[PDB]
Amino acid sequence: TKGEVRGGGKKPYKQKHTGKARQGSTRNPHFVGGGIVFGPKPNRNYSLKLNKKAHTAALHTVWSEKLASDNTHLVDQNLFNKTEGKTKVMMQFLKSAKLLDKNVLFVVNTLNTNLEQSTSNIKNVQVKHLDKVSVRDLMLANALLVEKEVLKALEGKF
Amino acid sequence: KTSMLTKEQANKRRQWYIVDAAGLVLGKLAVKAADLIRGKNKVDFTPNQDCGDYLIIINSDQVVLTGNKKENEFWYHHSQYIGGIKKVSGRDMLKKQSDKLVYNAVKGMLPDNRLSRRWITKVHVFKGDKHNMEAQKPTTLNWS
Amino acid sequence: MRIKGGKQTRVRRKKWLKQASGSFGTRHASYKVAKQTVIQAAKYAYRDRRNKKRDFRSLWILRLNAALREQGMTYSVFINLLKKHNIEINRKVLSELAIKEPSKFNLIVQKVKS
Amino acid sequence: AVQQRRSSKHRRDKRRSHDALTAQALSVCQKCGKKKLFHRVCSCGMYGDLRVKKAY
Amino acid sequence: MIAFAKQFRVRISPQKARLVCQLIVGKKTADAQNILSNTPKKAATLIAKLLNSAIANATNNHGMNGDALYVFECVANQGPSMKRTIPRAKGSSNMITKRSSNLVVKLSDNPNERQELIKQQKALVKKRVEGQQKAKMAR
Amino acid sequence: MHAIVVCGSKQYLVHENDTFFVEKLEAPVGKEIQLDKVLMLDEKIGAPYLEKARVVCVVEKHGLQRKVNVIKHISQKHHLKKYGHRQPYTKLKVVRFVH
RNA sequence: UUGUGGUAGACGAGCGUUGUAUUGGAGUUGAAGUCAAAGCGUGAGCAUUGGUGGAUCCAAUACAAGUGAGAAUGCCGGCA
RNA sequence: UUCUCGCAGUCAGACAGUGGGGGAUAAGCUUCAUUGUCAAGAGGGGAAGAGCCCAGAUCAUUAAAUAAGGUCCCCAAAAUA
RNA sequence: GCGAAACAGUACCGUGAGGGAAAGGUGAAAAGAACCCAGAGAUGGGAGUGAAAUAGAUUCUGAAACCAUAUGCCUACAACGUGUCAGAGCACAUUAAUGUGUGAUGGCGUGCGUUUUGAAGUAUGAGCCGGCGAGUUAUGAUAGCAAGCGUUAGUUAACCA
């Protein structure tokens, strides 16, 4: 700010009887000294609060609009466990299911280690828990693969 | 929109005339002199190319004023020096220099533009009875 | 996000300077002067877009009177003989350039006499 | 005193309109292959006939 | 055919060398050195050496006649100037500006090529017009 | 021969095979239109207007005139109002005007 | 049909820049900037083309602004 | 042009006709009231003008009929008696 | 951007407290130009390397005020805020567009901002040019608009994950 940079507290010129301007100080916002009058400060909140009912209603609406399409499919423990730590098997899976270009996200209730071992070197796939996913990411996928278990919990939380 | 009104293309043609003022008055002679200079009565006038004619007036001495203008009105000329007011009367010019009177009056007829310095070269006035302008074959006419 | 903002100033100044072309002195190079010059030029254009429609009408009347004084009658009398008798809404610039087609205006001149 | 309104390039150019250098007359010496001045002697030392200055 | 000889930061003012540029322009090679080497100005003397070097370059490298040339164009270009400070009365200093000059000269062989640059400009604008025409037939 | 037409509120003389320019008449392109408001045909004088006389002509092309940028500036009183304007016109020639 | 002069001023409708979020595209067959050109809007502005240049930009929707210069006897830098 | 409400800015006026005060019925004076202009209003006339006299400029048009004012020319327009 | 991207609290201003600068970029790699011509030399023109030498040691991009040279046109009887509307002539042909540059000639024509009862001012602010150069932010209140929830409604703060 104006009074935080080091400079001169003494006027370079006397106020009058000088051919140049009235202003005297070396770090005004009108010199080459910095000192911007108005600007960002390191205390900005950058956050906005929403009522919890509205947020859960938005989550429910997004879930309802995304479960009513053929793009998504149901996924269970079977193909999570049948694949090894190798990521190539899941690539062959995606090629078979032609979901390569889709930014499919895995939503899982059990937090399986076999699935989460893979998918970490692809910009398109990532594994998250039910409580971890938000409204945004859930609609960023363009393709959903949901656990069979999460239906009951989603109904319970509405 | 517009019909593109026609202007001449510097196809200026002039004629010569003789007007022997015998009992004319200065103002009514000067108005028609300017009329002939600017070609006001000609059907082909535009101000941008000086559509005019030539005017030669003879026997300038014989033009007569009216009323008591002879001894009352004064003609003034100024020299840029101090007190240089050349003041004359009508009867003085009418005997000494009569062409100057009509010359100044006609120069008073024309607008103070860049054509007046070319409009005034079109008039020729002579104090006496003879002129050397008998080389263009003009046509005589009165009251103009 | 600190903003530099360089393109806008350049494009605005170039656009303003391009308008005032063929200008005396430095008035076609200094943007600060060029804007004032184009302001005054466009104001003159605004006033002249009516001044010219008036001045043309003035020259219109003048050149009609020039032709009509040759027939020994008055221009106002000609407008009169158009309006009250032998009703004619004939165009003035029409009858003006009908001087250019020879003697065809004389038909209208002789027609006003019933 | 000082000037009130800035003199543009026009004023300076019309002022310098008469400042150009005029050429000086030249002549050829009879036994000196040089383009020397008029009524003068060049670097070889002859005004023509009479000699006067060193060769160089 | 140009056969120019450039020079960079001579210790001379622009106008003074410009004067001898008007002085030299319009004459051939034979009647240039003689008139240049007698003017009592120090701006002309450097131009004489530069013109001699240009003459040598033209005669050697580009290989024209070397006896049918004439000076074509002389510049007085303000080169990178210099700034110093000068004392004055009562401690009111001023900035003295030492002027520079970028003096170059060009030679021509024919009474033409003053129009060949114009011809090349016409070719350039013609190629611009042709490039515009090419896009008009892409519909 | 020579003829006279009026369009909108502006009047024009017309010569055969001669073009002239008027405001947009809201007409299709390339057809022959037969204007009614004709006045003072060759040696045929209708005092209010010409009786049962029409002038036929084919429109050549629609066009836009030179750009006119009118700017309103009150002197030293915080005013820089601007406006642009062009003129949609029709260029047309006559072929067979009938008495 | 009624109107459309306009500062102080209320109020409505929009453009532009930077960055980010995605969705598409261009790019050593040549981007941006910049030079000039006789383009297109009601406007802030937006195109096309040739030369300069050898690495980043563009289009549509949103969001956040060190954000749009003619003046402050300005300040830095250059130049009459 | 009344009511409820959001949100301003204005607290130095000038001018002309008229009705009055201070001034000596002197001001381009001051101070009040009343009708209009200017502040924030371009155009035309008044030769040159914020206030005077005509009226409300969206723009383009080389298109008509008028207001105040003028018709010898400058500078568009007229004469008859 | 910290005043300091570079041998910055240095250079410098001061006797001293202290005040306190500016500037970085060739090219992929010096491959930094052997050698020749002019000149004393700096240097330039060449040749040579290199895709490029208009990348040449002044070393990325190179526009403004500025100053020169050149095509086409115009000016030396002209009262001029220098522009605008008509306008002949002249030389060219374009982002094909009632086209472009120049403008002899006629009509009209007292700048831009600020402050002001009042501006071209014999008040003021600017020499030009390029860059920087002011309505935001934190915490609360009021009022409009919009959204969610709603008949015992609505609602989370700090804090933990």
mmCIF file of C-alpha atoms (C1' of nucleotides) in Angstrom, chain F residues 21 61-66 73-79 89 91, chain I residues 86 97-100 111-116 118-121 123:
data_model
loop_
_atom_site.group_PDB
_atom_site.id
_atom_site.type_symbol
_atom_site.label_atom_id
_atom_site.label_comp_id
_atom_site.label_asym_id
_atom_site.label_seq_id
_atom_site.Cartn_x
_atom_site.Cartn_y
_atom_site.Cartn_z
ATOM 1 C CA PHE F 21 -30.585 6.853 -57.801
ATOM 2 C CA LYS F 61 -29.215 -2.773 -57.679
ATOM 3 C CA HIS F 62 -29.635 -1.975 -54.010
ATOM 4 C CA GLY F 63 -26.745 -0.222 -52.314
ATOM 5 C CA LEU F 64 -25.412 1.578 -49.260
ATOM 6 C CA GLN F 65 -24.025 5.105 -49.491
ATOM 7 C CA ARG F 66 -20.858 6.488 -47.929
ATOM 8 C CA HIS F 73 -20.478 17.619 -28.876
ATOM 9 C CA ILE F 74 -21.630 20.382 -26.554
ATOM 10 C CA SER F 75 -18.780 22.814 -25.944
ATOM 11 C CA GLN F 76 -17.013 22.034 -22.655
ATOM 12 C CA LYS F 77 -20.154 20.616 -21.025
ATOM 13 C CA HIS F 78 -19.515 16.862 -20.607
ATOM 14 C CA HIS F 79 -21.001 15.723 -23.899
ATOM 15 C CA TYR F 89 -30.713 3.336 -51.840
ATOM 16 C CA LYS F 91 -30.064 2.452 -58.466
ATOM 17 C "C1'" A I 86 -20.253 21.990 -53.787
ATOM 18 C "C1'" A I 97 -16.902 0.242 -54.137
ATOM 19 C "C1'" U I 98 -22.554 5.994 -57.194
ATOM 20 C "C1'" G I 99 -13.825 4.224 -56.456
ATOM 21 C "C1'" U I 100 -8.618 6.664 -54.877
ATOM 22 C "C1'" G I 111 -10.132 25.220 -30.439
ATOM 23 C "C1'" C I 112 -10.294 21.149 -26.273
ATOM 24 C "C1'" G I 113 -10.918 20.577 -20.836
ATOM 25 C "C1'" U I 114 -11.976 22.813 -15.758
ATOM 26 C "C1'" U I 115 -14.363 26.578 -13.022
ATOM 27 C "C1'" U I 116 -18.348 29.577 -13.847
ATOM 28 C "C1'" G I 118 -21.587 33.591 -17.833
ATOM 29 C "C1'" A I 119 -16.277 31.310 -22.807
ATOM 30 C "C1'" A I 120 -12.085 31.916 -28.396
ATOM 31 C "C1'" G I 121 -10.558 34.555 -24.383
ATOM 32 C "C1'" A I 123 -8.619 34.031 -16.406
#
